[PDB]
Enzyme design. Structure first.
Site, PDB file in Angstrom:
ATOM      1  N   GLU A   1       0.871  -1.206   0.000  1.00 18.85           N
ATOM      2  CA  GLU A   1       0.000   0.000   0.000  1.00 18.85           C
ATOM      3  C   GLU A   1       0.896   1.242   0.000  1.00 18.85           C
ATOM      4  OE1 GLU A   1      -4.150  -0.290   2.214  1.00 18.85           O
ATOM      5  OE2 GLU A   1      -3.212   1.642   2.740  1.00 18.85           O
ATOM      6  N   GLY A   2       0.490   2.319   0.673  1.00 19.42           N
ATOM      7  CA  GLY A   2       1.452   3.432   0.794  1.00 19.42           C
ATOM      8  C   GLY A   2       1.019   4.787   0.282  1.00 19.42           C
ATOM      9  N   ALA A   3       1.975   5.492  -0.324  1.00 21.67           N
ATOM     10  CA  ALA A   3       1.810   6.864  -0.849  1.00 21.67           C
ATOM     11  C   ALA A   3       0.735   6.910  -1.933  1.00 21.67           C
ATOM     12  CB  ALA A   3       3.127   7.363  -1.382  1.00 21.67           C
ATOM     13  N   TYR A   4      -0.308   7.721  -1.722  1.00 21.62           N
ATOM     14  CA  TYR A   4      -1.484   8.017  -2.609  1.00 21.62           C
ATOM     15  C   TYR A   4      -2.252   6.816  -3.170  1.00 21.62           C
ATOM     16  CZ  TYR A   4       1.954  11.602  -2.663  1.00 21.62           C
ATOM     17  OH  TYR A   4       2.898  12.480  -2.237  1.00 21.62           O
TER      18      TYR A   4
ATOM     19  N   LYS B   1       0.631   0.288  -9.755  1.00 17.94           N
ATOM     20  CA  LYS B   1       0.463   1.246  -8.636  1.00 17.94           C
ATOM     21  C   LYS B   1      -0.766   2.096  -8.956  1.00 17.94           C
ATOM     22  CE  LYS B   1       4.494   3.334  -9.228  1.00 17.94           C
ATOM     23  NZ  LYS B   1       5.164   4.643  -9.008  1.00 17.94           N
TER      24      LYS B   1
ATOM     25  N   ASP C   1      15.671  10.489  -1.855  1.00 18.28           N
ATOM     26  CA  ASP C   1      15.007   9.536  -0.926  1.00 18.28           C
ATOM     27  C   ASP C   1      15.527   8.118  -1.160  1.00 18.28           C
ATOM     28  OD1 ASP C   1      13.331   8.976   1.234  1.00 18.28           O
ATOM     29  OD2 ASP C   1      11.586   8.593  -0.110  1.00 18.28           O
TER      30      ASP C   1
END
Ligand SMILES: Nc1ncnc2c1ncn2[C@@H]1O[C@H](COP(=O)(O)OP(=O)(O)NP(=O)(O)O)[C@@H](O)[C@H]1O
Length: 344
Positions: free
Chosen positions: A22-25, A43, A138
């Site tokens: 899951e995660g970012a946006y 994604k 990152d």
């Protein structure tokens, strides 16, 4: 509309969905590509409510579409509505990678040969990124994908920026987004992270983590991050301090008790001595003294792989700042729509 857990509407062409994170946006699934007859990663990104999500999404898409490199995840396809009005979600289709270095280091010992090959591929991708005037900002194990044959691909350009060394200086304790454990010491002191040397620090952290399966500098917060770094490197030299002209940052460092450098061979007694020589050069306190990507590739540790003619640079560098901080989300949704048009 096919479902997972939520709508995952990649429909006819992409089937046999399996939830893999899951995660970012959004959320990430594997899927069977009924056209190309391979499993792929998809994604789902849902960012159009939040200006900051739209920025990260537009950056990732613009950069990954421009880049073409064996060590950087590509976009094979993008699924979105034919109109801005109907476009809520964007599906990014990529090569399916079996794992990432984070999941790998949780459970697997790496041989010296694997450490060497993984570092080679990280630096080979990084040479291309930097050659494009881009900073990743990152780099960490979770943003390094691996397939079953140990091919490594850098991903996650959400915090990436065009390099801007002229405008890198800032105050002491300036706020920052990228993972604390892989942040160069200058971020906490006087740097916005707008110089290529912040990526080389992160690679150095990743090399240390591959040598022991433990984060080398696991700070719990901003100043703790600096005590962890200074716990191993020791107190900065007068020459390195004289480079810090910001009085709050200089006087903080002067306030700290003296610490002697801990030798890398004490931390990593079974490591290849060539690996530790290169680690030392990547984890240099002074960013002006820190090894550059091309010098790291030419280091004796990497002599089995090093071939600068097979370490390509970018055809089309980002000349200019991506002027995204002040675009309203409606403009950023339009830019994302225009950036994705070639896949319709
Ligand atoms: N191409 C891919 N192949 C396989 N798994 C992937 C791929 N890209 C991401 N994943 C995994 O999907 C899960 C969620 O993705 P994530 O870690 O968020 O990827 P990212 O590209 O770094 N994006 P994000 O962190 O959300 O900004 C994690 O377990 C990832 O390792």
């Amino acid at each position: 509309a096919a479902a997972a857990g939520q709508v995952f509407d990649v429909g006819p062409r992409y089937t046999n969905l399996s939830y893999i994170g899951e995660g970012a946006y959004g959320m990430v699934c594997s899927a069977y590509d009924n056209l190309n007859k391979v499993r792929v990663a998809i994604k789902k990104i849902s960012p159009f409510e939040h200006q900051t999500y739209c920025q990260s999404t537009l950056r990732e898409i613009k950069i990954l579409l421009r880049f073409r490199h064996e060590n950087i995840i590509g976009i094979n396809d993008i699924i979105r509505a034919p109109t801005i009005e109907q476009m809520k979600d964007v599906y990014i289709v990529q090569d399916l990678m079996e794992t990432d270095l984070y999941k790998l280091l949780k459970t697997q010992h790496l041989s010296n040969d694997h450490i060497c090959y993984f570092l080679y591929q990280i630096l080979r991708g990084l040479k291309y990124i930097h050659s494009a005037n881009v900073l990743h900002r990152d780099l960490k194990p979770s943003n390094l994908l691996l397939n079953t044959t140990c091919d490594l691909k850098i991903c996650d350009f959400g915090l990436a920026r065009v390099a801007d060394p002229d405008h890198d200086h800032t105050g002491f304790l300036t706020e920052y987004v990228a993972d604390r454990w892989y942040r160069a010491p200058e971020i906490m002191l006087n740097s916005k992270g707008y110089t290529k040397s912040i990526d080389i620090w992160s690679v150095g952290c990743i090399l240390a983590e591959m040598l022991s399966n433990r984060p080398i500098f696991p700070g719990k917060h901003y100043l703790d991050q600096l005590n962890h770094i200074l716990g191993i490197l020791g107190s900065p030299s007068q020459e390195d301090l004289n480079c810090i002209i910001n009085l709050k940052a200089r006087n903080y460092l002067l306030s700290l008790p003296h610490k002697n450098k801990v030798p890398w061979n004490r931390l990593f007694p079974n490591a290849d001595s060539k690996a530790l020589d290169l680690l030392d050069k990547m984890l240099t306190f002074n960013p002006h003294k820190r090894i550059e990507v091309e010098q790291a590739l030419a280091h004796p540790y990497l002599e089995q792989y090093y071939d600068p003619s097979d370490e390509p640079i970018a055809e089309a560098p980002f000349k200019f700042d991506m002027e995204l901080d002040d675009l309203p989300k409606e403009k950023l949704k339009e830019l994302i729509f225009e950036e994705t048009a070639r896949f319709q």
